[PDB]
């Protein structure tokens, strides 16, 4: 994979989206590859934190679109697989949001444990109602969990973004670094610099043990949502609305 790299640095397994010209739009194979990277981090006994970083002005613009058209099975299969990988990951997942995230990639940002923002222009957009689709990526559970049920209905029902002010009002962002959007590279490195200082002295297996207990609060709900989001969308695909709108 050329759009995504990774490396390990002490207890940190770092994943980097490096396709800024295309606003880190991702195809099915990029979402599989992201899931396999989380599997590799999850099985590395030296890794304690899995940091997701991107590049350019967008974190990611979401799915990249270019009866063989039954090609929606590999689409649906790639969404489930990468969602399930984020849900079950046992290492502390940290998103460095260097700009907006849209669709599935915004769904994965909502599954990370901790989120840092480059500046106040970040936003998350879930345009399901505009694509003739329904919740995906576990957002049925993660959005009301992290932004509250009334705010989630306003955004999802009317295809409106979860903006910075909403994200701060809910504690979704742990720290805003207030850096220009023209340098994700420097924001990425300053998050890693603060992280290296904050882990000093700590017993790192305690982070994983607390995460394991923390995750048991909503883990069944998340696995259930992953399966019913997919079950429920099938008729939307059979009707064909998404296909038309996806041709746009």
């Amino acid at each position: 994979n050329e759009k995504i790299s990774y490396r390990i640095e002490g207890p940190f397994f770092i994943i980097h989206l490096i396709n800024p010209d295309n606003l880190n739009a991702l195809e099915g194979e990029d979402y599989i590859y992201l899931g396999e990277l989380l599997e590799l981090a999850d099985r590395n006994r030296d890794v304690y934190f899995t940091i997701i970083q991107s590049s350019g002005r967008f974190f990611s613009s979401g799915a990249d679109f270019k009866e063989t058209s039954k090609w929606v099975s590999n689409f649906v299969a790639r969404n489930v697989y990468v969602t399930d990988a984020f849900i079950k990951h046992s290492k502390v997942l940290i998103c460095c949001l260097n700009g907006p995230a849209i669709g599935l990639s915004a769904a994965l940002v909502a599954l990370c444990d901790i989120v840092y923002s480059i500046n106040d222009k970040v936003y998350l957009l879930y345009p399901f109602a505009n694509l003739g689709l329904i919740t995906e990526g576990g957002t049925t559970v993660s959005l009301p969990l992290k932004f509250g049920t009334n705010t989630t209905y306003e955004c999802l029902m009317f295809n409106k973004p979860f903006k910075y002010d909403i994200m701060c009002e809910n504690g979704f962002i742990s720290k805003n670094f207030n850096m220009p959007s023209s340098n994700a590279e420097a924001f990425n490195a300053k998050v890693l610099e603060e992280l290296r200082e904050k882990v000093k002295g700590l017993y790192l297996p305690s982070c994983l043990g607390m995460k394991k207990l923390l995750k048991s609060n909503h883990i069944d709900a998340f696995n259930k949502a992953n399966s019913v989001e997919v079950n429920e969308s099938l008729k939307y695909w059979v009707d064909g609305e998404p296909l038309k709108r996806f041709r746009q």
Copy 2:
């Protein structure tokens, strides 16, 4: 019914409380009639949104009070029936709060998916402790859900209002229109004007499909709360405190 009207406008089924002289206080039969209206909206395949609007300076002052006194069975039966109608409604429920809401009618505002406020003087009051009663209308679940558990205890235990500032601090209000309280009529129409613009372009069945999945997060808890609130209150009624206080 003379206190409540309704009409349909494209995908919007609009319900209007139109008894401003009495601060849209409602009797048992008005709460049944409200439940039947939601049933009619729920079965209309053209309706996607059910908008609740009122009139005057109050959204509603709550229940209107004027062994045949075993008249508390029709009271308890009307609360359950209208709560159950809000809980199971499948269309997007939107409250236009044109002023304060008290009691059962404040419980129903907390069951809507989205809430807009006329101005910063709105408040929700649940004076159960002052009437010798306990939670009703599903507020056992909806209040800690939408306002947080510590804030819910402060308000409920001490008969204190959930005011505007608390509502905004929790994202309970999606938009404050900042209009005078002397014209609910203009606020009602401006909410409908914004709604007509926000649905343009959207695939409306996607709104209902996301709501169906969203509602499965807490639907069992809500149905359970509706039944145990009623079970639990019966001894309060047998003791007779509410009867005395309701005579006041």
Copy 3:
């Protein structure tokens, strides 16, 4: 017990931590004694509210540390017993936070129904990662419940405090009294003065009936967390990290 007193005043059972020179650090026996006091309040049919108050500049600095070293069984047994007492208490629990609370005593502050703060310097610290331990005191559930899941991960994973600003942003504090930290005594009395005015007129059994229904939302999760936090920590103790760090 010399470090903790109690008294009853109308419907209020008042518990007072009175060891300000040692920052109300508590040993195992002080945590048992606190649990027994809650049992006494819980069985007193005249008590409706259980108020916890402290003294000095700290609410409490947490556990006081001075194969008989299998002394961690009485440690683990005292944490479970006092957590279980806070979880199942049927009277309205109110914490008067006169300064910071750390560890188990910060876990118990998060189990109270209502919390008042002396001033904006209060904070809650859970330094599990720094002691080679994991969540305790039901904080697996109470922290994400009251502060949100992303904020809880930032604080717990990196041994960072839940400060005043975070507490207000989540409605954790019902009222800040903005008094100097040199007089907890006057803050304690002004909370009791406001409480005596707010209960006037109310039907006090309604407070307990609403609390009983309110508590059934998360009571199983809390009991489960109390048991799995303890189950899960045992290997941390068998490995011996906490023992070393506790020697510091």
Copy 4:
């Protein structure tokens, strides 16, 4: 109460239905009194077993029937109260079935932990379909639990008895004493004689501790069934079929 006596004998609290001329038919007040007896046994720290015994040829023929007709509230309230008493009882409940049991009293036989039969003519009958009613006494859960789901549908749907052969095929009866039906008195005493021999040597608190864990398998289902059976029947009563049939 003249129809029911009780006594304590070592670890055994013995309850005896002593109205053989009327086939131990019970009224609402007899079912309350039975519930209060179980409360007395449950709070006696010397009792470990609660033995229910009757007299004559029937264990019990069920409910004794002789807008004040809203007399069905005390009916429904007495069924719930005595069912809830059997469900939550913490001592080992043992039924000595000296003949057939019908209706609510057959529902209570199905809530005992252990059942002995006088001879092969015993049967349990639940004639809900013949009275225009639905399951009661927790039989929604206890019948499929103890007799299997297909057999429960045959009996309940067609108002057919659960006979001895069905009871033995499911292990419902621990021992048949094969005594004439003209002497319940001797069967009652021989059950007590065997019981006194079987408890010898045993650690009696172990019986209660195993029962507490055993009961947590279905206790929520039983409490839920008690509440929804009652909720669901209300419309049957509002329609008036049972009233007519109960006049027969």
Copy 5:
């Protein structure tokens, strides 16, 4: 449809498999049609019982088998749809087993409320292990429910039939009519004759109300099993074993 007829007779909606030459083997469209018939019975306010009857010596031999081979999606979609129809049916489902039932059709026999057998040669066979498949039709839940967990493992793991003796030992069969296998027609009519006599006198809405409460014991488990059986099989199909074995 030529392989399946139906008719209504008082409160009985009768469905009849009438393809004895082919041992009432069914294709996908026959399983859809069976589901639609149950929908028609379920919405008929005069029907209280839905009786399933067949013809000839077999009740049914199961699925009839004669990248377009992605034809397994319509296969999987037809199994889910007809299972879901049996699970949610609100009328009393009664199977008249006139001979053996194999596969999906044996799964549907295990979802009926009541089962009558023509004679002791009936058996149910679930040859999942022999087709490279896993449980289907809700048999993950219905088999351990109705035959016990150890017996279910013996049969399923080793592709062995649930025979008559096993069915009687578990109360799966309510009545064996002991008629020759050369006349299903007479057995069908004698079941209907007994049914007409057993409903006399009964309040038929009481049958449906008891079924509604009875079904809430395992309805979530059944819906869950229907969805995870399908989710889990997909990799068996991707591997291709079933395809090979289905070519046999």
Copy 6:
């Protein structure tokens, strides 16, 4: 380990208790070793079935008994560990019961998927009430599951065996081989001979996939029971009754 051997034969991982002179009584270390063997079988991708076989006239007489007396922690820790290993095992567990099994080893027989008996003299005994203890090994759930709730109370409350006739009446035994008790060796080999014939032709991964779905019916209940049995017993140990009785 000298008391237990194992070997692999095609898809069968065979475990053999080979201490007939001591009636295959087991110590803590033998129960750990049994758990580790199940781990080895569980991770072997060639094994599909885990067969447990013993020797002599008893399958096993249970635990072998010969403040350091706080030796009950290693006792309790060994019971949990080996129970958890049986609960989570993913391969088909088959017990060859060559005679009676008592205590923990009888608890493990009740956790196997399939059980074969040498002859009609086998029995299972759980003498918790006679040792001043409570349910262990997951028997809180497995006994009512496999023998029914009333029969379980008779046996457990009165320290009476689950005998062959009770085992057959519940389908607990899939096949009785009716061989003398003086040759377990020949019974062991004839079970393996039948097993080798029954797996022929089958798709072996289908056995594991059906087991995975089958086990999700009660797996949470089993894990919960393992943890609360242990939590609940601790006070029995603190009181000291078991210690006294274990000295006997």
